[PDB]
C-alpha cells in the first residue's frame, strides 16, 4: 500500500440539498460517467480526503484543472503541506469560492485533479465532471 492514499473528493456547499461526493478508490474511468451538480452562484469548497500510512510527507499540493469545450484551461494550485501517519484520514479544504452564474455559466465542466507534492509524486490523478445548473434539480 502506498504511503499517501487519496480516498474521496467532496464539494462542501452548505446550501446543497444533499451530499456532493465521490469515492476516489474505485475505477477512475468510471468516475467520469458520474457528474456532480452545483447550483450557479453557490459558495463551495473543494475537500480532499486522504490517508498517510507510514511516513511523514511534506510539500503536498492539490492541482485542479478545469476545461470547457473549446476554451483554455482554468488552473489552480493549493498548498496542502506536511502530514504524519495516522489511522484516520485527513481532510484538506480549499478557501471558499463562488461558482459562476448566469445563462452563459451553465453547463458541464471537465476537471482533471492532481494530488501531488514538491517531489512531483503522483499520489492520485483523476478526471471528474461538474455541472452548473440554474437550480439544484434540472
Ligand atoms: O467562472 C470562471 C472564472 N470566474 C470565477 O471563477 C469567479 C470566481 C467568483 N465568482 C466567479 N471559470 C470557470 C469555472 C467554472 C467552474 C469551476 C469549478 C471547478 C470545480 C468545482 C467547482 C467549480 C471552475 C472554473 C471556467 C473554467 C474553464 C473555462 S471557464
| Beta-carbon contacts of residue 33 (< 8 Å; ≥ 6 apart) | none
Q: Which three cell numbers stand for residue 128?
A: 471528474
Nearest to 63 by CA among 130, 133, 9: 9
For residue 70, how far is the Cα from the chain centroid? Answer: 22
Has residue 51 been placed in a domain?
Answer: yes
Looking at the structure of the chain, the number of domains it has is: 1
CATH of the domain at 83: 2.70.50.30
The answer to whether residue 99 sits within a structural domain is: yes
Pocket of ligand 1 contains residue 75 by CB under 6 Å: no
Q: Does 130 contact ligand 1 (Cβ within 6 A)?
A: yes
Distance 29 CA to ligand 1 centre (A): 23
Asked whether residue 21 is assigned to any structural domain, the reply reads: yes
**Domain, as residue range, for 64:** 4-133
Residue 99, Cβ density class (10 Å: 0-12 exposed, 13-18 middle, ≥19 buried): middle
Experimental method: X-ray
Q: Is residue 81 part of a domain?
A: yes
Atom 7 of ligand 1: nearest residue by CA position: 100
138 inside domain: no
Taking the C-alpha atoms of residue 41 and residue 31, their distance in angstroms, rounded to an integer, is 25
- For residue 102, being part of any structural domain is answered with yes
d(CA 50, CA 64): 16
- How many angstroms is the resolution? 2.1
Amino acid at each position: 500500500a502506498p504511503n499517501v492514499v487519496v480516498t474521496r473528493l467532496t464539494l462542501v456547499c452548505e446550501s446543497a440539498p444533499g451530499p456532493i461526493t465521490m469515492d476516489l478508490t474505485g475505477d477512475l474511468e468510471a468516475l467520469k460517467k458520474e457528474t456532480i451538480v452545483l447550483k450557479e452562484g453557490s459558495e463551495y469548497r473543494v475537500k480532499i480526503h486522504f490517508k498517510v500510512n507510514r511516513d511523514i510527507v511534506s510539500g503536498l499540493k492539490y492541482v485542479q484543472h478545469t476545461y470547457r469545450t473549446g476554451v483554455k484551461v482554468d488552473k489552480a494550485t493549493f498548498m496542502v503541506g506536511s502530514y504524519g501517519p495516522r489511522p484516520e484520514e485527513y481532510e484538506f479544504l480549499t478557501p471558499v469560492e463562488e461558482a459562476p452564474k448566469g445563462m452563459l455559466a451553465r453547463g458541464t465542466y471537465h476537471n482533471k485533479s492532481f494530488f501531488t507534492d514538491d517531489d512531483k509524486q503522483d499520489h492520485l490523478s483523476w478526471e471528474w465532471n461538474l455541472s452548473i445548473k440554474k437550480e439544484w434539480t434540472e
